[PDB]
Design a protein around this ligand. Structure first.
Ligand SMILES: *[C@@H]1O[C@H](CO)[C@@H](NC(C)=O)[C@H](O[C@H]2O[C@H](CO)[C@H](O)[C@H](O)[C@H]2O)[C@H]1NC(C)=O
Length: 158
């Protein structure tokens, strides 16, 4: 009816928002990084086979038998996915991505189980030897808060 009554509603409605978005902004990013992960996976098939058939991790996308160009394995929030010695790292785009996750990435690497291998998912890693990787510490890793509970693996997870 009156002006002020409206301002209260508007103030009320507007306060539930300011309060509620630092968590939607995260549900959001946590949704986006969740795909960088789905695009990262599916590259496991290629990579696993290459390793088991040859006993050497595929050096790049072409070796693993996937889109030779990493930029062809891109998405909406994913600007690409590159295989670097069995390690598959997904990168977050720069257009259409939260704010503190864009340009950031995660990695998926595996480990010789002997006759088979086990996969890990976590923050950017680099392969050292056929059975050892390490934190690709550089400052572009997707922050722990944005990663699922299933993608919290450390460089030395076994
Ligand atoms: C695919 O991954 C292989 C991993 O073993 C890698 N081999 C080695 C020994 O690193 C392949 O590279 C070889 O084959 C290419 C073919 O053009 C090229 O001749 C390289 O010199 C050779 O090492 C990887 N293939 C590619 C295309 O890089």
């Amino acid at each position: 009816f009156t002006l002020i009554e409206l301002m209260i509603v508007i103030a009320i409605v507007g306060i539930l928002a300011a309060v509620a978005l630092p968590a939607y902004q995260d549900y959001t990013a946590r949704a986006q990084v969740s795909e960088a992960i789905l695009l990262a996976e599916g590259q496991k098939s290629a990579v696993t086979e290459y390793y088991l058939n040859h006993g050497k991790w595929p050096e790049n996308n072409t070796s693993a038998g996937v889109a030779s160009s990493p930029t062809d394995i891109k998405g909406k929030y994913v600007k690409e996915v590159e295989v670097k010695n069995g390690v598959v790292t997904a990168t977050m785009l720069s257009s259409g991505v939260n704010n503190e996750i864009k340009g950031k990435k995660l990695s998926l690497w595996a480990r010789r189980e002997n006759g088979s291998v086990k996969w890990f998912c976590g923050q950017p890693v680099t392969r050292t030897d056929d059975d050892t990787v390490a934190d690709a510490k550089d400052g572009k890793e997707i922050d722990t808060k944005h990663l699922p509970s299933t993608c919290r693996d450390n460089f030395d997870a076994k």
